[PDB]
Design a protein around this ligand. Structure first.
Ligand SMILES: *CCC(=O)N1Cc2nc(-c3cc(-c4ccccc4F)c(F)cn3)n(-c3ccncn3)c2C1
Length: 298
């Protein structure tokens, strides 16, 4: 029974879908416009209309609306009609998966390590709340600004990403904070490869036997062995042997302090974090919310 004041019930008359942004396995993402009651103003919003109980949907949506963390997208409004529409703050930059693909071999080491830090802080918040995401992947990490990423779609899996799933989840539908750690390792791998698809050319049916044999995702060319060992540690068979989100925040923050020693990127001395001037601009314009300082190179 969380705070019902975090979820605003929207009527079909207060909003309108205008543009198409993309679509995934759960639904289609639209750029929306909210017209608040008794007002003339049009306010951009992001709307996800689902693909396929009202009391039960709302119960889950209140939990989804209670996630208050700088690296977790909070559900803001819901519109229950014949379809289920979810409303959240519009993010022009979209997902990190497409951002890294559209910026292939053009992303600095400071960005990658800081994103790994931020994703770990978002998941660590979810673990403190005893919440399991179940669908962590670079497609479910949104870019607020290039220096601020946030985990999206928490609770959508509750209402199959085999290549992002831990073996116990594939075999026994078991989902814990430690299976989320496995998915996180796969997500870090997607970033380090600038958007590569994991186990490309391998049918989803073969993955469980491939894992049981001891096969894992290859070392991305930019990762030193210390970075690869952390990703490997995330894919251990024994869930309790895998690192904690708590430990991943510290390890990746320590690595962000010496970026060149942990990632080998060509043209990296040029690709630095933005000047205070450009970060002040981005913040006042599109990121007023309070977040921890991005880890700088000593
Ligand atoms: C690579 C894919 C991509 O570019 N995007 C995926 C995506 N989803 C959403 C989104 C998510 C949600 C949402 C958030 C919390 C809980 C439940 C839930 F459905 C939503 F309501 C609406 N959109 N976006 C998105 C796009 C633009 N601004 C914000 N979110 C993307 C982008």
């Amino acid at each position: 029974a969380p705070n019902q004041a975090l979820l605003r019930i929207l009527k079909e008359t207060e909003f309108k879908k205008i543009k198409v942004l993309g679509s995934g396995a759960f639904g289609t993402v639209y750029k929306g416009l909210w017209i608040p009651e008794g007002e003339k103003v049009k306010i951009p919003v992001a709307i996800k209309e689902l693909r396929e109980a009202n009391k039960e949907i709302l119960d889950e949506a209140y939990v989804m609306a209670s996630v208050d963390n700088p690296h977790v997208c909070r559900l803001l409004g819901i519109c229950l009609t014949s379809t289920v529409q979810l409303i959240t703050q519009l993010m022009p930059f979209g997902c990190l998966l497409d951002y890294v693909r559209e910026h292939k071999d053009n992303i600095g080491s400071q960005y990658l390590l800081n994103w790994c830090v931020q994703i770990a802080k978002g998941m660590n918040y979810l673990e403190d709340r005893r919440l399991v995401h179940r669908d962590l992947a670079a497609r479910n990490v949104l870019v607020k600004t290039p220096q601020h990423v946030k985990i999206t779609d928490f609770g959508l899996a509750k209402l199959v990403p085999i290549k992002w799933m831990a073996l116990e989840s594939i075999l026994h539908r078991i989902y814990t904070h430690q299976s989320d750690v496995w998915s996180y390792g796969v997500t870090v791998w997607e970033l380090m490869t600038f958007g590569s698809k994991p186990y490309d050319g391998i049918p989803a049916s073969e993955i469980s036997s491939i894992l049981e044999k001891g096969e894992r995702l290859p070392q991305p060319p930019i990762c030193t062995i210390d970075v690869y060992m952390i990703m490997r540690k995330c894919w251990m068979i024994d869930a309790d042997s895998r690192p904690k989100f708590r430990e991943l925040i510290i390890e990746f923050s320590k690595m962000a302090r010496d970026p060149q020693r942990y990632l080998v990127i060509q043209g990296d001395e040029r690709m630095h974090l933005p000047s205070p001037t450009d970060s002040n601009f981005y913040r006042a314009l599109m990121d007023e919310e309070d977040m921890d300082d991005v880890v700088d190179a000593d």
